[PDB]
Amino acid sequence: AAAAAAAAAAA
Amino acid sequence: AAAAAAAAAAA
Amino acid sequence: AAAAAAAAA
Amino acid sequence: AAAAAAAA
Amino acid sequence: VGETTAKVLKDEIDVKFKDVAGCEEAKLEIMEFVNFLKNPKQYQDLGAKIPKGAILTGPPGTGKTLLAKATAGEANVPFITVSGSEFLEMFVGVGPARVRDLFALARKNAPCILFIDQIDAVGRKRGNFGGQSEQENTLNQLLVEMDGFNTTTNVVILAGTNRPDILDPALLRPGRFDRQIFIGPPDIKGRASIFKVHLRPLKLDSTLEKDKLARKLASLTPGFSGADVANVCNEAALIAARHLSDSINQKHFEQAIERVIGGLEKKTQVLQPEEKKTVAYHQAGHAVAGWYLEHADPLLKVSIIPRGKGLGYAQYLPKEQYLYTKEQLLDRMCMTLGGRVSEEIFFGRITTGAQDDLRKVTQSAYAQIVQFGMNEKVGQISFDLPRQGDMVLEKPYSEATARLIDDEVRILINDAYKRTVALLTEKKADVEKVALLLLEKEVLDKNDMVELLGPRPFAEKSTYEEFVEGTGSLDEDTSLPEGLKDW
Amino acid sequence: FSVGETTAKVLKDEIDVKFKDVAGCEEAKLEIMEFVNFLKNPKQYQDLGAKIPKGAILTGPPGTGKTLLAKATAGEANVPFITVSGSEFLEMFVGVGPARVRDLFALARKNAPCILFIDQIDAVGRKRGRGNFGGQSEQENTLNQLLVEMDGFNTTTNVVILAGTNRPDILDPALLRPGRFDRQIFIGPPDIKGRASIFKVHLRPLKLDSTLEKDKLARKLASLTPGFSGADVANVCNEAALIAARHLSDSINQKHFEQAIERVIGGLEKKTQVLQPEEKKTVAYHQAGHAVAGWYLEHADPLLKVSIIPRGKGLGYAQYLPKEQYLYTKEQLLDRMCMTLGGRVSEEIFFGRITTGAQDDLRKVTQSAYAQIVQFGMNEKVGQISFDLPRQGDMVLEKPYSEATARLIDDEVRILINDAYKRTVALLTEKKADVEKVALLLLEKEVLDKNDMVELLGPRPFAEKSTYEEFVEGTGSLDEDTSLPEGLKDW
Amino acid sequence: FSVGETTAKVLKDEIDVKFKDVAGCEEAKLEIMEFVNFLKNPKQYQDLGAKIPKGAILTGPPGTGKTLLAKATAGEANVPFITVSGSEFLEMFVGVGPARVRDLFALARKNAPCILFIDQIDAVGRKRGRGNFGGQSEQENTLNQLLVEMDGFNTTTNVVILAGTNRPDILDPALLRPGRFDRQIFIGPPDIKGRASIFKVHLRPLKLDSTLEKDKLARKLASLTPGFSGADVANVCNEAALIAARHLSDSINQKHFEQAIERVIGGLEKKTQVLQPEEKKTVAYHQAGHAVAGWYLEHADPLLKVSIIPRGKGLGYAQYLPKEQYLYTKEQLLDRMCMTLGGRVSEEIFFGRITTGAQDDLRKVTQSAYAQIVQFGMNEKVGQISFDLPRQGDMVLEKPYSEATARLIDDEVRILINDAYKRTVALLTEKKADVEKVALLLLEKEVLDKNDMVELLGPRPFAEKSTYEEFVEGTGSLDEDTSLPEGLKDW
Amino acid sequence: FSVGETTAKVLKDEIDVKFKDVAGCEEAKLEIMEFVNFLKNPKQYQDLGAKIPKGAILTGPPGTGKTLLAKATAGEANVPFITVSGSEFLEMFVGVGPARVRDLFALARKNAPCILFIDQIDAVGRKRGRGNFGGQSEQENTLNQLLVEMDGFNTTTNVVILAGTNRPDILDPALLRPGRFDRQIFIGPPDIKGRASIFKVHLRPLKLDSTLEKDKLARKLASLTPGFSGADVANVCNEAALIAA
Ligand SMILES: Nc1ncnc2c1ncn2[C@@H]1O[C@H](COP(=O)(O)OP(=O)(O)NP(=O)(O)O)[C@@H](O)[C@H]1O
Ligand SMILES: Nc1ncnc2c1ncn2[C@@H]1O[C@H](COP(=O)(O)OP(=O)(O)NP(=O)(O)O)[C@@H](O)[C@H]1O
Ligand SMILES: Nc1ncnc2c1ncn2[C@@H]1O[C@H](COP(=O)(O)OP(=O)(O)NP(=O)(O)O)[C@@H](O)[C@H]1O
Ligand SMILES: Nc1ncnc2c1ncn2[C@@H]1O[C@H](COP(=O)(O)OP(=O)(O)O)[C@@H](O)[C@H]1O
Ligand SMILES: [Mg+2]
Ligand SMILES: [Mg+2]
Numbered sequence A, B: 001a002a003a004a005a006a007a008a009a010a011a
Numbered sequence C: 001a002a003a004a005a006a007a008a009a
Numbered sequence D: 001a002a003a004a005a006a007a008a
Numbered sequence E: 001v002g003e004t005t006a007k008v009l010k011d012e013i014d015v016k017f018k019d020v021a022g023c024e025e026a027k028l029e030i031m032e033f034v035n036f037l038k039n040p041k042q043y044q045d046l047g048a049k050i051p052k053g054a055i056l057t058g059p060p061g062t063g064k065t066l067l068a069k070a071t072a073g074e075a076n077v078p079f080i081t082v083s084g085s086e087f088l089e090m091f092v093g094v095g096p097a098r099v100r101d102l103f104a105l106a107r108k109n110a111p112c113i114l115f116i117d118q119i120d121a122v123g124r125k126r127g128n129f130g131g132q133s134e135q136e137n138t139l140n141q142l143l144v145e146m147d148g149f150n151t152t153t154n155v156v157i158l159a160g161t162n163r164p165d166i167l168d169p170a171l172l173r174p175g176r177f178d179r180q181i182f183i184g185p186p187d188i189k190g191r192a193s194i195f196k197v198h199l200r201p202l203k204l205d206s207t208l209e210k211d212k213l214a215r216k217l218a219s220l221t222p223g224f225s226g227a228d229v230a231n232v233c234n235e236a237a238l239i240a241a242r243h244l245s246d247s248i249n250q251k252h253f254e255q256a257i258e259r260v261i262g263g264l265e266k267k268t269q270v271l272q273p274e275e276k277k278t279v280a281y282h283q284a285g286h287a288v289a290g291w292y293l294e295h296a297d298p299l300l301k302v303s304i305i306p307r308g309k310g311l312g313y314a315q316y317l318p319k320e321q322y323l324y325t326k327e328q329l330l331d332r333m334c335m336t337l338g339g340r341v342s343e344e345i346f347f348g349r350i351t352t353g354a355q356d357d358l359r360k361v362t363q364s365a366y367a368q369i370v371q372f373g374m375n376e377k378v379g380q381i382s383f384d385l386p387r388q389g390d391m392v393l394e395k396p397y398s399e400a401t402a403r404l405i406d407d408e409v410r411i412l413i414n415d416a417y418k419r420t421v422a423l424l425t426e427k428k429a430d431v432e433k434v435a436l437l438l439l440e441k442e443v444l445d446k447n448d449m450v451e452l453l454g455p456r457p458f459a460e461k462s463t464y465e466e467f468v469e470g471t472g473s474l475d476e477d478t479s480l481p482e483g484l485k486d487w
Numbered sequence F, G: 001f002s003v004g005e006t007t008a009k010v011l012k013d014e015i016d017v018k019f020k021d022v023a024g025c026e027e028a029k030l031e032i033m034e035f036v037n038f039l040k041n042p043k044q045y046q047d048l049g050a051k052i053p054k055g056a057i058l059t060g061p062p063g064t065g066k067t068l069l070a071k072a073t074a075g076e077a078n079v080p081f082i083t084v085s086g087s088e089f090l091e092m093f094v095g096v097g098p099a100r101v102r103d104l105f106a107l108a109r110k111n112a113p114c115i116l117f118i119d120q121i122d123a124v125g126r127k128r129g130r131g132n133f134g135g136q137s138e139q140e141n142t143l144n145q146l147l148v149e150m151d152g153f154n155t156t157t158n159v160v161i162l163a164g165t166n167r168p169d170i171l172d173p174a175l176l177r178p179g180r181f182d183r184q185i186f187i188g189p190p191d192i193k194g195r196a197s198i199f200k201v202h203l204r205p206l207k208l209d210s211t212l213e214k215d216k217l218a219r220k221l222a223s224l225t226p227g228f229s230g231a232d233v234a235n236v237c238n239e240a241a242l243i244a245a246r247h248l249s250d251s252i253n254q255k256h257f258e259q260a261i262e263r264v265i266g267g268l269e270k271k272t273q274v275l276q277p278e279e280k281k282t283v284a285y286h287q288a289g290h291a292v293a294g295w296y297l298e299h300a301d302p303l304l305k306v307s308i309i310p311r312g313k314g315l316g317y318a319q320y321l322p323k324e325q326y327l328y329t330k331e332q333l334l335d336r337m338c339m340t341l342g343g344r345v346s347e348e349i350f351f352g353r354i355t356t357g358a359q360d361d362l363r364k365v366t367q368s369a370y371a372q373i374v375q376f377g378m379n380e381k382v383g384q385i386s387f388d389l390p391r392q393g394d395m396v397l398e399k400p401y402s403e404a405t406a407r408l409i410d411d412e413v414r415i416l417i418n419d420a421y422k423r424t425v426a427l428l429t430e431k432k433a434d435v436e437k438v439a440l441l442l443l444e445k446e447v448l449d450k451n452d453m454v455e456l457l458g459p460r461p462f463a464e465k466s467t468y469e470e471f472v473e474g475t476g477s478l479d480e481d482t483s484l485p486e487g488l489k490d491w
Numbered sequence H: 001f002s003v004g005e006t007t008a009k010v011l012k013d014e015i016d017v018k019f020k021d022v023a024g025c026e027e028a029k030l031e032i033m034e035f036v037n038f039l040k041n042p043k044q045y046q047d048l049g050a051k052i053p054k055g056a057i058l059t060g061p062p063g064t065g066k067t068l069l070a071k072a073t074a075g076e077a078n079v080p081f082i083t084v085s086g087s088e089f090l091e092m093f094v095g096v097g098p099a100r101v102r103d104l105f106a107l108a109r110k111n112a113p114c115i116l117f118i119d120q121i122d123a124v125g126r127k128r129g130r131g132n133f134g135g136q137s138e139q140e141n142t143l144n145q146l147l148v149e150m151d152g153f154n155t156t157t158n159v160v161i162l163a164g165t166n167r168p169d170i171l172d173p174a175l176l177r178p179g180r181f182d183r184q185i186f187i188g189p190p191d192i193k194g195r196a197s198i199f200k201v202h203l204r205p206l207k208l209d210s211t212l213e214k215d216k217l218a219r220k221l222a223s224l225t226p227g228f229s230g231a232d233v234a235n236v237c238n239e240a241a242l243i244a245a
């Protein structure tokens, strides 16, 4: 299984 | 939902 | 199946 | 099959 | 961002405690939550720490949001609501900052109910990646200010979700979400009280009483939740004005029940006069077999008008119970096989109909042999049987056991089969009567079965007043305790 | 940041699709018109206390007009209408998703009596799992936002939420409850009376002959197209015009529609035949075995066009007219096996040499002998037991019974096919002259009409039904009745 | 924000590929010339009411002219042409699949009569499954966004959406429906009439000899290259110029073509990799078994050249001319097995010792024995049952049948090969002296042509067809007619 | 983001590897000097009407000198040489594989007459199948992006797509068709005529005894090293340089 990251942006 | 007990199709 | 056939090699 | 041989 | 997206609502909502009506033992415990805000004295007389709130749990469609609406209207305290998903934002640092602004809004309206619908969007199992660390710090922000209500005297926080298992056990400690008010699907006492709420805004027929009918509609609708009841009372009004009828009668409610669980009653379907004769002889075999077995469910409605994924159907009244004996499972197999048997006696030919009948005969008999102890030869064993649709990985037993299992399931089905063939051959003329009446009317009710077959030879249970004699109260009761003298 | 927009267009273009364009699904379009009937005439319903129904799901196989039925509502209801796709909510951040459903409905509250349509709702409607893969959590936050906004606090009225999908079984039961989606409408593939009215919609912009009235042709064309859908009829109307104008003709003949059917069912008819006369002769005797066995077996499908011109991935084809049935018996399924095996039998009688050209005939006979025994209950020895078969695209991961049962099953497929095989061999060995007559005529004309079979073999000795009026004898109505109820007579 | 644009290319280079550069498949050209003929002559098609078809899929084996037939479409059409691949849509994040499909149709419908091409659509058009791992989550959000853009509310006219693929069967039925992909076009490998016109496309830039004519040579090279694809003919024409330029020749000889057909089939030809004198004696007896058994069997392939020089993964090399035929019988497959087993038989009659050199000769015999029994219906004990036999790159999970059937299969393979073995041992003992004649010349002259095996063994005692005009003359056309219809007479 | 780039270093410096340094592959150096003979003298081939082959594949056991024969192909034509491994594409995320194929060929065209060498292509060139395993569908995405960038639209000229492998049987038929990999070249293990020449490439930097002739000693060490690969012979001449040190 390959990951699909959900990027929380920083400041 | 509840009990239906149908006669399904086969085509 | 609407139509049978004769397949290839 | 267009090729026959003796493999290594 | 930082915006809390909560709404301090003081609006005169038309939801009262008279609109819940059936979750009564779950009703008093939120009346105790209003008692915490209005009376901090009689719960501190015994040195009891006043709990912070409960989590409303249960299946979808039950009342875990409506009972929070009724708290906002009945209690004169102000009300603030969010959902759990309104907290996670793009920027890292907003999620653990909105929960400040939600719980600071609850101080400026200090005695208040505060409801978080679908809390499983925040309360989850912690973990990792920065996207998972965001809801970790958000849930930690919920737990810190939950415990930080020692300075204030009165802030109560309700919560509602339909998945209590995914919640973090850090929420469930003392000083936190202590109680778990399980709001579950009602029995027929509480369900008739749900119909009385939604028979109320309807312009019914003049020959119908709104309490003799709410008991009749609860009798015809087993297993429904509080949403399926409010739908039948709405669909039967939409069916009524479809024909420009003057008032809603009993025939409109019997179709709205028939609409929800059946499908789409469509007349434009073409069927040859041989393929209706096969379906009519099929589902008379389900009707007579359930009529003559003791532990079969009572017949409710049989029709051959097509409903979506079916050529016909037989609506039953499932006996809502908790335990199944070995022969209460046998009479359901002997009834489900009954349609295929009737096609064999009348015709001699076997159709691809009763394919979904033969699935239920298989997935009952596999569960009956494997994961109960219903077979002496296999023994008193129980296996985690993999469900259909999911992949089967590797069997937890031997090949010689699977040879023993699959040879006994074949004995179990033929014992259910020979009993039905013996049933529907002695009763052959009665299946002929039920089917030809479907061949001209196309819908049969239980009243049409009693007029054709006589009464059912078994001590059945169909009326609401004979469903209720097991306790002796004869009606569903709504009363207050002695410590709840303000509601 | 400004990624909080719903990317949903308030549809201001006047869509020219009325409800007269949506045929076939007659009882499904009635329950969409009651959304329009309520918002246009609330007095019929509010006098009986009927609240507005909250939404609807439009399910069914793909290509059935569950988007077209939403296109009819935009062009007929005089309320604002917005559209959005179910896979537009998720983007590459955490707040997006839930912060996009919240502005889907805040837009849908500025338009107060509006109707919104979510197409392919199974992109954010997936059932919520346990503590699992990290990409699954953002789908559950977008779903949990959608569930609160459809039924909860600050849930306004007068917002009808139409929705469409073709996998309703993966949907969350929290979406399927009433109060979110009060109705679940299944738009299935229509019957022959439904297809005959879908032809009447799409024969309407064509240009037929001085003959060929557009009403009587639609009855003929639904006969020749069993099992099609709402969009398969749309190509047969369209691609018959592209054949009519490829030959530079003035008006579309009947012979141009039949070449639009056989292109979609079969494939590319190849002009340059390449076969040697010793291997065109084998295909000719093979296709005559499909012809004669289908001609002399009851419950076999009617024959249209036997052709040894190569088409698609085959060296010939047969072009049957499949009987649009819902209940196959045991003897009807045998005479498809005794017909699909009929080509190899005719090779084996004439030549004595089995070929590899009957590979696709044998895979059909294999799969219609396992589904009778495992999936159905047609076998006495295995029992009245039904299972689920793995499909061709599905991968066989573990067989859900014992190997002593699978030994019993495979011994019974082999008896079932050999019983179907010996019947065909004992059918084409006394009709050996009739297979000889068909395939010799295949070696000059290279196609056959059904009338060519009548001139050669005679009338078919079984109760054959071919036209529209003899398919719709039973219902006695002869046409799809688009009659409206009394509360729906504003159209 | 940053990630999300479609990374498409509205191509501005004038592609020099015309429809005359695509040959072998006129039945696939003509259904793609109808898209360009619409965009040049709309009045012809709109006098019959024909809408434009909304797209087409190009299916087939690798190397048949599917991207080339999309290059030719960008050639003649006077409209812009936009190109993406299938794998360009998913990148590392959630939502950036569907967010990149929408930006594809933003750039698409911005140009009004555009044509769009999605090469290798298997990366996105993969069939939507049920509840599984999270890698299938964001793929199905990209597929559902595509299906909304193909046929939905945001669907404008005159936008042609072409796509090509190798794997049609894994695609979604919602994607292959009418309305999404109206035309389904299978471009198979070319036939012999098809191949001679592919040579005429690629013999066109070559500087041939003054004796050779490009029409007669294209027929000869199609007869010498059986079973090749369309991109093989482009390689034979290329490498015959590279062989001609190693020898510093002024013009390409026919002999330079026969060294290119051998180089593509055979591999690199190691002249310096010498063998021991007791190894060359073994390899020559092995290759003479392939020569003599292929010489005296009827349905075996006609032989071109036998060598004992190491070529690729191999010590010897044989060069055959496979018969282009589409219907193998039971005898025509035994004679191909009795020819392949002839190498072990000859070094066992002469030596007694058997070597490991017949490994690849036994992998062909094994795979041609499962295929007769499992996949075709060539067996009595197993019956006329067909199963999907797994390939070499298919890691088999579990058999589609029982174990007592797999016991039944592997018994019948042993009966099959040991009847092919005994038939060849009875062959190369009756012809034992002729095998010794062939291999003693192989030790002297390391290759043998067909002519010096006629000098040894006489003429081969079977009718063998060798020229183009002999391979074709049964049909009666002798060429591939590029006869466009009446309404396509702009090309 | 830093995940997504092709991480393929460009050896645009003049490589000191020539065909003088590759031995034992005399019949296979002739097929690969044609790529260099095209780039030096295009007029010789274009009079007959020839084209360059788009790329060649190098099959054989490991250590037989595939990268050495690929660096010699760049060091003759003075072209840039781009190295990439077949295992450098399979990042754990989704769609990063096709995102690095598109960056590889973008780098293969910014340096336009270059020669691209994809090492161990059987990691992302495995044959595409059905729903085998979770994570197998990411290799099929990376393979389909490799198919487009070689023979399709956006196809350049003057690139030589070289690729070494060990197992050509597991490769996709769509890679091995002519148009992607026009030449299939098998580099086997060297025989004793082969690797005696391989010793003479590596014995010439060493200082030997006054009694040992390099024509004699390379014939004898090839007898004392049966079945070694080409890389092993290069260590035998290097390990004994350490032992004498
Ligand atoms: N006990 C009840 N009596 C009457 N109507 C009810 C009752 N419970 C639910 N309803 C109806 O259901 C609607 C919404 O119920 P609701 O509490 O939102 O269900 P739910 O359990 O919250 N499902 P969910 O949204 O997943 O939490 C109300 O507006 C009523 O119309
Ligand atoms: N009942 C119908 N009557 C007339 N045309 C129809 C009908 N159903 C479908 N069509 C045609 O089919 C196309 C739209 O099909 P539609 O019913 O919208 O399929 P769909 O299932 O919604 N699309 P999808 O969600 O991707 O499966 C248009 O070209 C319509 O003309
Ligand atoms: N019918 C044909 N006529 C002429 N040349 C052809 C033909 N078919 C293929 N070719 C040649 O083959 C090359 C590759 O064709 P191309 O269509 O790109 O591969 P393909 O058939 O599409 N298979 P693929 O793209 O890998 O799925 C073209 O550049 C032509 O040189
Ligand atoms: N034929 C040869 N002649 C000289 N040196 C060689 C030969 N083959 C291999 N080598 C040596 O082995 C190394 C080649 O790398 P190698 O392991 O063959 O790459 P790959 O594993 O990709 O085939 C070089 O350092 C080179 O010195
Ligand atoms: Mg709720
Ligand atoms: Mg649609």
Ligand SMILES: [Mg+2]
Pocket (backbone or CB within 6 Å): G066, G067, G119, H147, H148, H151, H152
């Ligand atoms: Mg391509």
Ligand SMILES: [Zn+2]
Pocket (backbone or CB within 6 Å): B005, B006, B007, E282, E286, E339, E353, E354, E357
């Ligand atoms: Zn039934």
Ligand SMILES: [Zn+2]
Pocket (backbone or CB within 6 Å): C004, C005, C006, C007, F286, F290, F343, F357, F358, F361
């Ligand atoms: Zn056939």
Ligand SMILES: [Zn+2]
Pocket (backbone or CB within 6 Å): D004, D005, D006, D007, G286, G290, G343, G357, G358, G361
């Ligand atoms: Zn051999």
